Design a protein around this ligand. Structure first.
Ligand code: BA
Ligand code: BA
Ligand code: BA
Ligand code: BA
Length: 223
């Protein structure tokens, strides 16, 4: 119920374990060099072929909290996702796509969230030739968290901000957090209009220093 299955092993999935409890994580892989590394990392190892439905079942993908898929090829990545969806239609699947062409192929396979790090890396490479300021921000906010970080803060039922305009909310002046967007119902609205009214269940996506984030957390609370 709480457990997370990881199909494949890479520096990404390793970094994924940084923020996850390790005894809740089952890593599904065939290779024995991977087994040593998984155990060394304090996570659980399940021997099998992630492109095989039989082994996917054995990994208890059925009731999983989420399944993370990064395999050696976008081909294997796509086949693993297809196999999961034969087992559980509703299970949350997060997958890493290597080639841009295949991002949409991962979605049509049932990936709930796709991440394409080579596409991101490549853009930043070419764009950092003449001006490196976009890359500096990405490194600080999305990687190292030197100063600030992105944050998703949910809006509770008893929230003082319910129904309030984003202009009247003035989240930047109060909190200090730059508001990127607000999502709900698996739909992300970026840079909402001034007349936008907050609803409960809405999630606020923003960027800010640690203190600025606590103030945003504080600002959204019981009436
Ligand atoms: Ba890969
Ligand atoms: Ba091969
Ligand atoms: Ba320059
Ligand atoms: Ba850190």
């Amino acid at each position: 119920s709480r457990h997370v299955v990881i199909c494949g092993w890479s520096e990404s999935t390793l970094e994924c374990l940084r923020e996850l409890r390790g005894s809740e994580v089952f890593v599904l892989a065939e290779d024995e060099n991977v087994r040593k590394k998984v155990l060394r990392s304090g996570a659980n190892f399940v021997h099998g072929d992630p492109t095989r439905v039989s082994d996917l079942e054995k990994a208890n993908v059925r009731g999983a909290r989420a399944v993370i898929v990064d395999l050696e090829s976008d081909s294997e990545t796509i086949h693993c996702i297809l196999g999961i969806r034969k087992i559980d239609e509703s299970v949350r699947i997060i997958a890493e796509a290597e080639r841009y062409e295949n991002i949409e192929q991962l979605r049509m396979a049932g990936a709930d969230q796709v991440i394409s790090p080579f596409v991101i890396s490549g853009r930043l490479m070419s764009r950092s030739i003449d001006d490196g300021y976009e890359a500096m921000f990405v490194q600080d906010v999305l990687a190292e968290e030197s100063t600030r970080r992105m944050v998703e803060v949910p809006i509770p039922e008893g929230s003082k901000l319910e129904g309030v305009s984003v202009l009247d909310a003035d989240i930047h002046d109060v909190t200090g957090v730059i508001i990127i967007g607000v999502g709900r119902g698996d739909e992300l609205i970026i840079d909402p209009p001034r007349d936008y009214s907050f609803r409960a269940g809405d999630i606020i996506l923003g960027i800010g220093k640690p203190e600025e984030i606590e103030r945003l957390k504080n600002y959204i609370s019981a009436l």
